[PDB]
Amino acid sequence: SQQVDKIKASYPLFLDQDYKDMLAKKRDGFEEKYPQDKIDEVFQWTTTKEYQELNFQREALTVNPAKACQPLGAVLCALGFEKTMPYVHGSQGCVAYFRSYFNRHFREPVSCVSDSMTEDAAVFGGQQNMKDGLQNCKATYKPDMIAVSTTCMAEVIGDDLNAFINNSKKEGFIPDEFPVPFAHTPSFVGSHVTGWDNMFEGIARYFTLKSMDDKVVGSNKKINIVPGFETYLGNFRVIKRMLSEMGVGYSLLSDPEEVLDTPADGQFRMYAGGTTQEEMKDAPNALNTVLLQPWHLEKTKKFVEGTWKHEVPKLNIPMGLDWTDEFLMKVSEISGQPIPASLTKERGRLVDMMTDSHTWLHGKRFALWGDPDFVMGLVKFLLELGCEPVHILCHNGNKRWKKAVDAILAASPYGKNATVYIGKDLWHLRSLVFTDKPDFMIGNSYGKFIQRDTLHKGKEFEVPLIRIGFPIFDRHHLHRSTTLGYEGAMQILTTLVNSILERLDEETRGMQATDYNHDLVR
């Protein structure tokens, strides 16, 4: 039943007696469900250290992954260029999913096409699909550039993207001078971040490889900035802000900040802003090139050092106090511009915030995960705050990365109860927060299920999720936050103390029970 002025949606509709009874008849009558005592026994066992050894002994099964496939990162990279249509060569299912995935995170439209390769194109090769697809996309959606990536099906069968695009131009499907950079992005290699690296390098190649003879390093007096797989709009914004604040001439290579944030003013804009073609062509003339997420920009680094002849600085991601200081001073060194009074003051304000809140942050234990750079900068920051990053998981991380983060953990007393796990998933981490319970988890939306599981064991065993990373599907407008710089560090710091205080207020809200510690001032 439904009362017209107090209409119930699924929750709490199904909690009404007639539905609850019907559901019980469905179960007892036709589901052949295991007895609750058995369901309860198996759950408790999935909580133990015994189950955890078994879980970690897996070599073929992956449950609840903390990563995605290459083409997704490729689409994001391509969206950072002016009026470009990300084009994925292969089957269409991939594209519907890529778009949906990014729609749900950014709450914005995401434009991307496929050339819909079907069973006969799998057998004959996707050459015809590439000819017509490039022609149709250019004629219909009118981009200035089409950036081609690939799905696994096209990678297995070895569709030569370079030959297919050249034959497309040769037969008159698209103009010979129409920009069509490409990158083979196999799903079965690396993850979404690798896709970004391959695509960026593919575009860099396209616009600079042939033209290197008239390039002089440092002649345009700018610093190139390569962001990497970035889903926080505030990160594009803070870097552009800090450099302009310093008077540093820069060029940000792959900037999707405008397309991923157009105004609802009455019109839909498929394309907005982005790195121009000329900014990519003029890129080798820069003083140097700073890669913001170096651990997944390795192929790009090799092309920049190899071909552009730039001495890319060994710099970590600018997250936290030290790495932001290092970034600014390196940028200062390279450009010749001094770090201004505004940034100096901003730094002291973050330190101020740290001295105000250290009491609640000290010794707080965290389980965390994400992409290698993000999770590494996060570990470092947590460590500067006096926190213990007990479980560090990076599904898509490699062995050298684990070494680097172990080195960082070794440098501080707060990283001594810490272990790094690469190639492990959220079902592995589910165990870790059960056997070696931390205070909070810092991760994406998939960790809401781990929180649900820990709460089923009991209120005391519940480990709360602090939503930082990608993807965030169950909260709104978090994609507008900043993770980079002092600005990002201040945001991260506030979220952590307030999550701690929120939780304390919750555990102390019991009348005459625990509320003796339900303090007005904290």
């Binding site: 079907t118 069973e119 006969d120 799998a122 057998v123 004959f124 090769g125 050459q127 297995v156 069968i157 070895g158 569709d159 030569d160």
Partner: protein, 259 residues
């Protein structure tokens, strides 16, 4: 009904002996069908619209009509070609996989079904020997180093699918180069099988080939024609089906050193 798969190096005349073997089969009054699953040869040109090309003309494979892909030739032998890409592109394996599925679902299946398969470089070229498909496998070879190496390799594939399901090696078929006879018998014994038949090198075969005919069609009363009839009768009556035991490269080299 008996489903059989024929593998073996192609540069010998594997498809030619497959079609000649069936021709004689038809001449005996046996109803046979040839399913071409080899991208390097034409498995039906001597007996006589591939599944892939016709599937594309109809939209997809689901719109395909078994009638647009089937066709009879000498002695009424039914013939279908799986189709595949033009050289250097696509995936011929998937073309075989798609072809075979279409035939299963469209119930294309008759005394014998003969699959003329290409090199087992992948999963798709083994589809003909999965559960409920070909039960007997014949490997045509010769006394050539790599021709024998090919048969031994194929045997390794037969082992994987034989342990899994029900398919066996029926024997070796020697396409003579006139160099040999004994060598292949020795290999078969090493493999634990038999040299079902030694096919002499008569030039009539080539005369027929150029005319687009098997020997049994071109000139029945010819000497070579009886050889194919004896091959046919031996395969019709063969009872020796086993799981091969492939040898090492060392064992093959050592065998060749004795001749």
């Amino acid at each position: 009904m008996r489903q059989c798969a024929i593998y073996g190096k192609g540069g010998i005349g594997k498809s030619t002996t497959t079609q000649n073997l069936v021709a004689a089969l038809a001449e005996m009054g046996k109803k046979v069908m040839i399913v071409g699953c080899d991208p390097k040869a034409d498995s039906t040109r001597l007996i006589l619209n591939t599944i892939m090309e016709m599937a594309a003309e109809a939209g997809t494979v689901e719109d395909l009509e078994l009638e647009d892909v089937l066709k009879a030739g000498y002695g009424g032998v039914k013939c279908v070609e799986s189709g595949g890409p033009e050289p250097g592109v696509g995936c011929a394996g998937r073309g075989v996989i798609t072809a075979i599925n279409f035939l299963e679902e469209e119930g294309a299946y008759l005394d014998f079904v003969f699959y003329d398969v290409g090199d087992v470089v992948c999963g798709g070229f083994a589809m003909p020997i999965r559960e409920n498909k070909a039960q007997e496998i014949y490997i045509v070879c010769s006394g050539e180093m790599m021709a024998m190496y090919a048969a031994n390799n194929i045997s390794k594939g037969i082992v994987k699918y034989a342990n899994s399901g029900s398919v066996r090696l029926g024997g070796l078929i020697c396409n003579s180069r006139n160099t040999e006879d004994e060598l292949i018998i020795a290999l078969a014994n090493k493999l634990g099988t038999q040299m079902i038949h030694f096919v002499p090198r008569d030039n009539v075969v080539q005369r027929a080939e150029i005319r687009r005919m098997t020997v049994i069609e071109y000139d029945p009363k010819a000497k070579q024609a009886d050889e194919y009839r004896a091959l046919a009768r031996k395969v019709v009556d063969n009872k020796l089906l086993v799981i091969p035991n492939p040898i090492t490269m060392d064992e093959l080299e050592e065998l060749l050193m004795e001749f």
